[PDB]
Amino acid sequence: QSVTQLGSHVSVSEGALVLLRCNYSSSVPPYLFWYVQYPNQGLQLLLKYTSAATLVKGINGFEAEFKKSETSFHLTKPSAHMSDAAEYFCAVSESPFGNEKLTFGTGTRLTIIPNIQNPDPAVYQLRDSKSSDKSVCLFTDFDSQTNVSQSKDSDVYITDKCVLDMRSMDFKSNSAVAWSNKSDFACANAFNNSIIPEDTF
Amino acid sequence: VKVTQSSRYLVKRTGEKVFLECVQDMDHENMFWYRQDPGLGLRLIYFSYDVKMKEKGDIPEGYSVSREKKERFSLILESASTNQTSMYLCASSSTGLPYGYTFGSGTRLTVVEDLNKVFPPEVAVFEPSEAEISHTQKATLVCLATGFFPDHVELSWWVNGKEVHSGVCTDPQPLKEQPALNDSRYSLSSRLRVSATFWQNPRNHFRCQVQFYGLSENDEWTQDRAKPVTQIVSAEAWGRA
């Protein structure tokens, strides 16, 4: 009959606790379910329950307690993993199998922050030597503490940070791209903000 | 056990009536059309509990619906406007089976006021900095996609003609090339990193592949530019000595 998810965006460190709020209202006996959505467009069942018990385990290491006292079904996982980064949806149904219409919450986007161990931030300038005029800047290998600011110049475009995982080398690295069509601009000064004295060039 | 929607992305114009299909191989009574928006979660537009049946959802407004045969449910937009641009999600279920919903995988509909505004991306790869290679013994290629509209791209790397999901990451969102302009074009970047040795093996082929979803063969225009249809725009690179 109704659901809400307080907090629409949660960012937590790798290995830190995940909590994703859900609370419900129902004139009739309620049944709840959690879904998760990735870059892969459709939602998928994370967990549900029959009333065979109150603490429920889900897929991908998750858990939720049905506290009827509290009108809640909060989702938790003791220790966050990078692949938990996704969007999550709490739902309530009148059917105990969720067959007949579900009402969904507003969702909570979950963002995991990587743990960069031996950072060494640097700014590199790349090209495709046969790209005419054009070349790009790559700020990479910065701690998770670091944040990239928006641009202050019509021709200077700068992306946000993004993490990659070379699983073969148990190696993660953050990275952010910048470029401009203004030929009077170099990588040397593109990123100016939240930027460290220990940068290679 | 598939729920399959007729299209994954679609572009359409303001004022226009629009039709979306959904099909299911499970003999299911129930079908549901939702949309999904940022901060609003999922919101039920319309639903059907049997052939020929319908009931209004939480937000039926500007929407009509049709269930005709038991396996398919259609959503109809009465007259497109920008606030019907969204991700459209079909689902089915059966009243007897104990399995709940099966969802399809969605169609993204963007609506626009002016059809000459839609463009395909141009795509470039940038080669590792020798500095990076020297300092870190890894090699980060950058892939860049620019001049695209609407926000409909899927970018993937392929090493030696084989898709990779390791050492990669792409901007979760695009950014506005001309952020004042109401209908500004977009840019997206991606990154593929490998060991410097691998990059220094000219056997190895790296290809950035962008997939763009624009106009269909049905739609019309006579602008001098190529019809900005659905298409894959790539760029390539060879390992180095």
Numbering used by the authors:
A (entry chain A): 1 to 201
B (entry chain B): 2 to 242
Give the exact sentences the study uses for this entry.
We generated 12 structures of the F11 TCR, that recognizes a peptide from the influenza hemagglutinin protein (PKYVKQNTLKLAT) presented by HLA-DR*0101 (DR1-PKY), between 1.58 and 1.89 Å resolutions; 5 structures of the DR1-PKY specific HA1.7 TCR, between 2.31 and 2.98 Å resolution; and five structures of the 003 TCR, that recognizes an HIV-GAG-derived peptide (SLYNTVATL) presented by HLA-A*0201 (A2-SLY), between 1.26 and 1.37 Å resolution. For the HA1.7 TCR, we observed a larger shift in potential positions for the Cα backbone of the CDR3α loop, differing by up to 5 Å. In both cases, these shifts were comparable to loop movements reported in several other studies in which the unbound and pMHC-bound TCRs were compared. In contrast, the HA1.7 TCR structures, in which a large loop movement was observed, were solved at 2.5 Å average resolution. However, there was clear density supporting both conformations in the HA1.7 TCR structures. Similarly, the HA1.7 TCR CDR3α loop was free from crystal lattice contacts and shifted between structures. However, several other loops in both the F11 and HA1.7 TCR structures were also free from crystal lattice contacts and did not shift between structures. However, we observed several CDR loop re-organizations between structures for the HA1.7 and F11 TCRs, while all structures of the 003 TCR were identical at the level of the Cα backbone. Thus, we conclude that these loop movements represent real differences in the conformation of the CDR loops of the HA1.7 and F11 TCRs due to the intrinsic flexibility of these regions. Although this analysis is an approximation and should be treated as such, the average maximal loop motion was slightly less (6.4 Å) for the 003 TCR compared to F11 (8.7 Å) and HA1.7 (9.0 Å), consistent with the structural data demonstrating greater rigidity in the 003 TCR.
